[PDB]
Every structure is written in structure tokens, then in C-alpha cells.
Chain A
Amino acid sequence: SRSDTLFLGGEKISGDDIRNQNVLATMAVANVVKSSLGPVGLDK
């Protein structure tokens, strides 16, 4: 394990996990306001 640097409070995600965490983090802010647009859309 590791040793790498540096903990604690300092971490890093690698390849897959990030490319995912990034996409999830985007669909998050996205999917919230995905209802808004369009005349059929509502307010919040």
C-alpha cells in the first residue's frame, strides 16, 4: 500500500473511479434541472 503522498485529508482517485465520479458528479447537477426546460417544464 502506498506509500504515496499524502494523507490524511489528501487523497486521489485513479482512472476508472474518477472518470465515473466525474460523470456522476455531472449528471447530478444536470439531472436536477433536466425537468425545467421545455414549455412542459416546471419551476422549483
Chain B
Amino acid sequence: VQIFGDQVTEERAENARLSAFVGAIAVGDLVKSTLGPKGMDKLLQSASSNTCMVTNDGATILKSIPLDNPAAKVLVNISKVQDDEVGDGTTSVTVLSAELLREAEKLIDIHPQTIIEGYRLASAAALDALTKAAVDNSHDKTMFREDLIHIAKTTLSSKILSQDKDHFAELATNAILRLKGSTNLEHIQIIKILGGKLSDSFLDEGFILAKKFGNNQPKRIENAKILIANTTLDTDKVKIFGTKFKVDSTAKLAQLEKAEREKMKNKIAKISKFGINTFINRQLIYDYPEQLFTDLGINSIEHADFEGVERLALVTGGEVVSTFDEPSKCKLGECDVIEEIMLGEQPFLKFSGCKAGEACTIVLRGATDQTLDEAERSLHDALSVLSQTTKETRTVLGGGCAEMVMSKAVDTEAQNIDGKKSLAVEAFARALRQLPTILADNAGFDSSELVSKLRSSIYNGISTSGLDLNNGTIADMRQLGIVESYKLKRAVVSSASEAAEVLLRVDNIIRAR
């Protein structure tokens, strides 16, 4: 009886396997049509916001799906995982899994908990060989830029924005360059506005704050020496707080003048700081911009926290604390500041030559207000790949090379073990072998005859190769410039045969409502 109280369901053994193995592939078939430019994007509508997302990103494609199954929701984690650690390929990190465990399923006809031993030891041999075939270097900034572009390209392909692939691959490799290795990708913010067309998405060496100058002031600035003030341009008062009572009637006769004056010290403190423009975290009283406009000092009321620093780390002028305590020694060396004239509201600008770098990769795409999103997340998938190469100089060739080398290597070992654990090995390879196969489905080439074709070439060449999606020749990926970073294609491999383990050990389950 008890237990803890039904209704609670319980699935064990045979079916619990299928329902999990078959349960995952369920996700995999839909997920796969997103490999190589001959790749698809899926729509995703959210109940609440009643707005839809269109893009192709394995992480998002699944993070946006309400799915009941534990084995599926599990995969949805793998994706949302690699996306974090690596950044690209998330679309496939499951593909090799669903296939992998579908392999394990057939193999299960034969203990499971041992199959995990193979997939962790045999796909370790694969993991190893893939390091061997890797190509390091160079480390000359002369050569780097030419590789990073090739990476950004191979990644930026197959995404709505592929049309001007270069245009973006450049956007990425730049923002990555600034801030050596390895720095957080949190200072370079991807802002987006709905502006006519595509490719009008440039990279910005400054910041693009939302706010527009207060009053009827100039829209441009020469030799910008901005000022990073904090406190609002309003008469101050202790945070603990205090009350001032006008005990004396004559005390107000002087109190009134104390008003206009206790803020006129703002103007004097501004001109004296040599600063030319200003902007404050907290808001400024209408009694201030008035003085600012006549002087010609520019008013920029209220700025976000992270924006207060962007404007700062752009010119390195230190975040001033309270007006009149600010040294002319601290100022913003901004090259220019303007008000771009977008439809409706227009954002202000903080251009910088270095700069500085606090890149803002603003992207427009009026064509579709929901393509910017669809795009500015692909620019990211680029960025995070152009960085992994900096942190990890290692790189490897795609187009099916990755899997080819493994399944090739792994293949031999399986025929050597002549052990039951050994068959395990062979599947670990046939799972990989599946990835390129699937990569053919989308391009259009017959799979079966395309891997065998591809596996011979690895032998003639080894391991450089791959299967061409579009350009003729079935040419090597190093020639066609189809490569992505090596550690990424590691995490992918391991991280998959990982969930393949945990998920292959469950055997039985218990679910309540």
C-alpha cells in the first residue's frame, strides 16, 4: 500500500529502455535538420508573451519546447549545456546521442551498465585520436585573424544571416580581439534596433545608449571630453535623512537664495573640469539642463548601471562620485558623440578609435523585427567560437572530418578486442559515423555511399577530409576552409556519451503527477 500515496506510475526494464531510447530519438529526428547551410530553422511560439522565435539554435530550439519526458528534457539539458561551455554545435550534441543510445538499444539485445564502460573508454580512444589530428598554430596575430574568420564563417553559415557571412564573421573576430585571452563576453553588449534591411549591422567601438540629450541641445560633439558623474544634479540630502524646519521666518529669506546657489556649484564645477559633455546615473532636475544648455554643456539624464561603466571603460575616465568632487584629470576621451536618427526614438553614440574595447555590435534588420533576434544570437554563436580558438589555439576540420577520424580509429579497436565490451566500441564509432551520414541527408547526397566514400579518403589522406555540402569535388575541409575549434568538438563528444551513460543506467523509474 504505502508507499507514499498514488497515483504514481512505475516503469522498469525492457520498455523503460525503449521508451527512453526511442524516447530520445524522438527529439533527434526533428533536431537534426540544422546541420550545414543546407540546414533548417524551426518556429517556436511561447504561450505567455504570445510572440514567436524562428531561429536555429539547438540550445534555444529545445529550451523553447515544453516537453513532458524526462529522457527528452534530459537532452534539452545537454544542449543548454554545450551552448554555455562551448557555444556552437549544440544542434548536434544530441544528434550523436539519440543515435548513440539507439545503437545501445539494439546492442542491448546484453547488459547495459557495461555498455557505458565501452562508450567511455572506446569513445575515449576516439577523443584521443581527434587530438592527434588537430592542427595547432600559428600564434602570429598576422595568421590568427585569417583563421578566426574561417571559424566565424563555418559557424555563421546555415544561419539566416549567412547571406553576408563575411559581414558578420568580421563583426565577431573583432570584438573577440579586444580584451586578450581570456576575458568575459559580458562587456560587449549586442544591442539591436528594428532598422530597414540586413547588413546594416555594423560593429561599434563605443556604446549605443538609449537616452537622447535633454532640451534643445546640439546633436554632435567635437573632441569629446565627457564627464562620468554619479550623483543627481539636485540639492543633496543625507541617506540617513533629516528634516529641516524653518524655525526662523527670516531664515527663508536666505534659504531661497541657498536653492539657486547650491546647484550653481554644478555649473562652476563642470566648466572647471574641462569636461565638454556629461551624464549621470541618477536623474537631474529641470533646474539643471537649463543652465547646461545655455553654457552648451550637454545633458544626458539617467543611464543604466552596466551602461555607466561601458561609457567609462570606453574612455577610462573613472566613474565620478558627486559633482564638484570631480577632477578635470578624469574625463572621457570620446572621439565623437551623435544622435542617430532612427524612426521614432533615436539612440545617442559614444564612438572610440581603439576602442576601447567595449564593443557594441548593434544589429539592424528591419526586414523582420524578429530576425534581429534570430540573427544577433547567431552573431553570438560566432563570437563564442572566435574566442575558444584564442583560449584554445587547437582547431579541427568539420564537414564530417571530426566523426570520420574517430569512427575510423575506433573502428579498428573494435575488431581487435574480440570482446563483448568490444562490440560496444564498434557502436561508439557507428554513432559518430551517423553524424556525417545525417549531414548528407540535408545536403542531398546519398548517405550510405557517402560515408564509405568519405572513409576511404581519410585513409588515402587521413584525417583531413569531409563531405562537401554544396561546392563540388567532395574536397578536403582544410582547402574549402570548413573548420571549427578542437576543444569544442571534444566537449561535444564526451558530454554526449555522458548523458548516454547516466541515461543508459536508469533501468527503472517512478513518476508522480
A residues sitting closer than 8 Å to B (CB atoms) are: 1-2, 14
Contact = CB atoms under 8 A, between A and B. Distances in A.
Nearest to B15: A1
A14 B19 CA distance: 16
Nearest to B14: A14
Q: Summarize A's interface: helix, strand, loop or mixed.
A: loop
Nearest to B20: A1
A17 B227 CA distance: 77
7 contacts: A1-B11, A1-B15, A1-B19, A2-B15, A2-B19, A14-B13, A14-B14
B72 to A, nearest CB: 12
Contacts of A2: 15, 19
A14 B10 CA distance: 13
A22 B19 CA distance: 27
B372 to A, nearest CB: 41
Contacts, number: 7
B245 to A, nearest CB: 76
Interface of B: 11, 13-15, 19
Q: Summarize B's interface: helix, strand, loop or mixed.
A: helix
B512 to A, nearest CB: 16
A19 to B, nearest CB: 14
Nearest to B23: A1
Nearest to B9: A1
Contacts of A14: 13-14
A35 B13 CA distance: 40
Nearest to A1: B19
A2 B9 CA distance: 14
A1 B15 CA distance: 7
A32 B15 CA distance: 37
A14 to B, nearest CB: 8
A14 B508 CA distance: 14
A2 B13 CA distance: 13
A2 B15 CA distance: 7
Nearest to B10: A17
A17 to B, nearest CB: 9
A25 B119 CA distance: 44
Contacts of B13: 14
A1 B14 CA distance: 10
A12 to B, nearest CB: 11
A18 to B, nearest CB: 13
A3 B188 CA distance: 50
A44 B11 CA distance: 42
A43 to B, nearest CB: 31
Nearest to A4: B15
Contacts of B14: 14
Contacts of B19: 1-2
Nearest to B69: A1
A34 to B, nearest CB: 22
Contacts of A1: 11, 15, 19
B43 to A, nearest CB: 27
A20 to B, nearest CB: 13
A35 to B, nearest CB: 24
A5 to B, nearest CB: 13
A3 B19 CA distance: 9
4 residue pairs, one from A and one from B, having the closest CB atoms: A1-B19, A1-B15, A1-B11, A2-B15
B382 to A, nearest CB: 41
A2 B16 CA distance: 10
A14 B13 CA distance: 10
A1 B11 CA distance: 9
B20 to A, nearest CB: 10
A21 B11 CA distance: 17
A1 B71 CA distance: 12
A5 B15 CA distance: 13
A2 B11 CA distance: 11
Contacts of B15: 1-2
A41 B14 CA distance: 47
A8 B326 CA distance: 79
A12 B232 CA distance: 75
Contacts of B11: 1
A1 B26 CA distance: 12
